[PDB]
Symmetry: none
Subunit: 153 residues, 2 copies
């Protein structure tokens, strides 16, 4: 897998002639392969062009927040490369204040209900100071390329 | 992320003053985050000290089998570096002949242990157009956790959930 992604990135670099360290690699979702595959598909499909993460969870003094212009490599629920996306914007938003504009871009009154359920859990393992107020890092992105082996138990 | 492993291992060679090539890096399971972490914690916690892969894939993939003494960088469910391990034993044995000894090391009755793995390999074999048989040879490794990825406590961007 590490090999696959190394290749995928390299190919993309050469294709656009530009030197860059590999970005972050991840799958959308709770962590389950289902959500990863489903959300992963909507992205490759072009139906899902946004994503949000818990802001509070970020360590303000140890790292910076995702910026416009950065890249990320997307994997499916089975952890296989799906595509690479470029982030075109980053807006901070409270759960109870997401614009239906962003909501449709990444996703409808259930939106909050489902997301509160989503994040109330991610916070759990830490100091899950949950509030409806919760601030989210809402990145708008676009697909700029898309991907086209052993098992140890 | 490519660098995270390059770095983790680099740091490893310094602590012991060794100059080896970076080993294979992989997570346990089929790639599912859940299984990836489940088996990952089992290893770092000292509970799961063995693994097994299908000797068949090595054959069809024309790869050498793991060697006694080799190292493997281990990733967790989020494809983030977890720990590095050293293989102290490599053994080939028919699946229907595994001892409960190996199963306990693996991480709980044999009938179940067997059913579990039968399925796992069933799915891994299929894509190579190969039906899982009852006594397909297994490639078993006995290792020891030789280093934990503690560089993880210095960044913060180590596992965020994106919706």
């Amino acid at each position: 897998m590490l090999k696959n992604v190394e290749v995928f990135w390299q190919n993309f670099l050469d294709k656009h002639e530009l030197d860059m360290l590999m970005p972050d690699v991840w799958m959308f979702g709770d962590g389950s392969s289902e959500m990863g595959n489903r959300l992963g598909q909507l992205v490759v499909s072009g139906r899902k062009t946004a994503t949000c993460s818990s802001l509070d969870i970020y360590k303000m003094e140890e790292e910076q927040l995702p910026k416009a212009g950065q890249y990320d490599i997307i994997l499916d629920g089975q952890s296989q490369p799906l595509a690479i996306i470029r982030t075109t914007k980053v807006e901070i938003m409270p759960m109870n204040k997401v614009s239906e504009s962003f909501a449709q871009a990444e996703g409808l009154d259930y939106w909050y209900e489902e997301h509160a359920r989503f994040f109330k859990e991610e916070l759990a393992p830490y100091q899950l100071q949950f509030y409806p107020d919760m601030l989210l890092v809402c990145q708008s992105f676009e697909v700029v390329d898309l991907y086209t082996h052993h098992h140890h138990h």
